[PDB]
Amino acid sequence: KIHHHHHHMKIAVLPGDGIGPEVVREALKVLEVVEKKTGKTFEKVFGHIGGDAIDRFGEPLPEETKKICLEADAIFLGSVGGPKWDDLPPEKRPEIGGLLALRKMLNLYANIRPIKVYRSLVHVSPLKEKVIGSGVDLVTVRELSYGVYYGQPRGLDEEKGFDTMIYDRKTVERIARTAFEIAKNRRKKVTSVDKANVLYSSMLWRKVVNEVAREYPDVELTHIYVDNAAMQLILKPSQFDVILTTNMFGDILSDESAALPGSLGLLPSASFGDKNLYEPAGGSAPDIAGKNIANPIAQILSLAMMLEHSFGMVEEARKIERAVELVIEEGYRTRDIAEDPEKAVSTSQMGDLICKKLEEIW
Amino acid sequence: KIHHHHHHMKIAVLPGDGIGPEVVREALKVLEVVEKKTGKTFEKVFGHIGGDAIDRFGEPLPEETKKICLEADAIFLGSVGGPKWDDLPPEKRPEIGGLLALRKMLNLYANIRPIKVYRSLVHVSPLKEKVIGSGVDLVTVRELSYGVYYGQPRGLDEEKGFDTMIYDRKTVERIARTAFEIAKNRRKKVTSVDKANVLYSSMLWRKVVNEVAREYPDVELTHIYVDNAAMQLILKPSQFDVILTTNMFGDILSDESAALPGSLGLLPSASFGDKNLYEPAGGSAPDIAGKNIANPIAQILSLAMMLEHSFGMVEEARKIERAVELVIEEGYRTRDIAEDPEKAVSTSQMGDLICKKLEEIW
Ligand SMILES: [Cl-]
Ligand SMILES: [Cl-]
């Protein structure tokens, strides 16, 4: 879609449980800098989800929260879940009854997971410095609406279980275009990952991606098998810009690529849907909840994704990205990325450093 | 099965094309040491497959070769394919009409792919030395007969393609027992990899593996999601002994784990079937075919797997494994694992070093 200049935006903020609130607080301090500099109004409507909603309403995704989510332009979500609520069944716990239920209600079709290895944290990566090479800067664009997680028929009886892996043209068109557009505004390269040598779903996938790629003549398209992509993420990850793939392969590969920066606290996530959903790629951290330890960068970079993809504020998002990088490049580390742990800054300190830097470079 | 002492064994040797013959030659020189030391007769029946068979018979898997394969106790296969035969259609090329056709005819149910990072080649691995930790020594046991590659219905039309991912009890029992038995004779740990939180096939998988695991009370069983296994292969691979998984997940994960030693020339493969099939994990190397460069270790360690799994000659196989390790530990390198390429030994030199060492330590 075309993003026109808008000066009033509405965000549903659902801070969650445990570290959620701590890191969402910092993200919102960065949003305050953006607000000051751009003169735009971000109307924030706060909503209760997960443990917070169970306590207040008796259920993890109450009607009130759903209404807030459906009335906002974008949804900004912290983390949900904690030991207080474990021991509730399945359907009633935060992570299932709250988070998975929200995701389902949004009819999401794409998950976008950017992965950067910062030059200054290469020593934190599991990969040797020469393997990282000229650098890692990629994005997985994963199909979320169909494929094997939703294909019918599916079922389980006493002797067998089955699922159907299926793609159709309209589904693949939608996600392919998403990936091509992201590629257009990045390094103009898409790699599509499938298993077209063995699976019919993947033969259809590849056929339709090749069709869409004609609408984007300036974007380089390569195709690789998922097993070979799994090896290439480790042997030469710098070859990738946008990685376009299926529900299942994207699930496996985006988690593999998450090992590369070597901390989940660094990694943002966006899902595109009826409304877009912005959240850290990693989950609950019950053992540090409340201690001002958690790394806020994932939540902050999720804010940057929201600005870019919900609001078309691409320049602003790139400035947030730059301020994070500059603070890291300066040597500042939360515990999750510190070699010397007693030299770690807190959640709140890290958040203030990023805000002061963003004001500096703006 | 129980391996009784046998003194006469029959092997179908299908050397293949390109580097196949070079490396199979060395493996067979190691087999000559084993023959001398054990006093056993290995009757080798040589067979033509791939390019070699096209040239001689007009097709890549002729009736003569099939007969040799079905009359032998085990099948030892080099590499097939080369530029001479590319440009034949699909069904008539070496890799499809020869290799995939052989595999299909054998009704294989398990692929076994051992992965070791030798202490002395850690610098060749893509992973940092501290990531490797206490060491990498694992084996993937992959189901080959069913799951999404074979489940019905399946198909492709103009607007959609689909496959069915399915497991039943009898299929999972068979592969689980295979993995448990391998674990029994190794470090008594199995990790089973599935997607039981989302897929019915995986719920059945997990249920039946848990059942089989009762027949093996001294083997530690863990279960992990495939996306988390994909991350753990990079972040902490030393936690794994036997990895038991499905057709598709094993395909992706065994290829990922192949990036860890950082050369395919090191990696053997066994498939269990009507007869067992022993081959290098990697393929064609047309650019070095005939130059006495190829690393023979994969073919040599495939011979060790054959001795162990077809013939129950476990001690002999561990001696071959030991002689390879000792030659590496000494500093000898073929080009694929040499930092200084002009200091590389040839295929034939590497093969002689291993034979002389095997004679030394026997
Ligand atoms: Cl899928
Ligand atoms: Cl499967």
Curated annotation (Swiss-Prot), chains A, B:
Q: Which organism is it from?
A: Thermotoga maritima (strain ATCC 43589 / DSM 3109 / JCM 10099 / NBRC 100826 / MSB8)
Q: Which gene encodes it?
A: leuB
Q: By its UniProt entry, which Pfam families does this protein fall under?
A: Iso_dh
Positions of the record's site feature: Important for catalysis: Y149, K195
Query: In which residues is Mg(2+) bound?
Result: D227, D251, D255
- List residues binding substrate: R103, R113, R142, D227
Q: Which PANTHER family match?
A: 3-ISOPROPYLMALATE DEHYDROGENASE
Task: Please tell me one Gene Ontology term that the record gives under cellular component.
Answer: cytosol
Designated name of the protein: 3-isopropylmalate dehydrogenase
Could you say which EC number(s) this protein's record lists? Answer: 1.1.1.85
The entry lists its GO molecular-function terms as:
3-isopropylmalate dehydrogenase activity; magnesium ion binding; NAD binding
PROSITE patterns reported for this sequence: IDH_IMDH (PS00470)
Family stated for the protein in its record:
Belongs to the isocitrate and isopropylmalate dehydrogenases family. LeuB type 1 subfamily.
Q: Where in the cell is it found?
A: Cytoplasm
What cofactors does this protein use?
A: Mg(2+); Mn(2+)
S-S bonds: none
